[PDB]
């Protein structure tokens, strides 16, 4: 939903659980529906496009 775009910079938080290979995201204090499951021994580089 179209926000005011002035309250604060859009802060997306990436969380990685290496013990379980779980990748989760937080939009603004709220957990996003999109999540990922990675194979063991994977190396993940924090990236922004």
């Amino acid at each position: 939903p179209g926000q005011g775009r002035n309250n604060n910079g859009l802060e997306i938080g990436c969380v990685v659980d290496a013990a379980s290979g779980l990748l989760t995201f937080i939009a603004n204090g709220k957990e996003l529906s999109t999540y990922y499951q990675v194979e063991p021994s994977t190396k993940l580089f924090p990236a922004v496009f």
Partner: protein, 34 residues
């Protein structure tokens, strides 16, 4: 606030990306790559 023992025993890491005002969020992707 946080639990020191949980932090010591955990394997969960975090970072955050702040898209500044004036940059359209639809043109920014955030996550991980190999």
């Amino acid at each position: 606030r946080d639990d020191y023992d949980f932090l010591m025993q955990t394997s969960t890491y975090y970072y955050s990306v702040r898209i500044f005002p004036g940059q359209e969020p639809a043109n920014v992707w955030v996550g991980w790559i190999t």
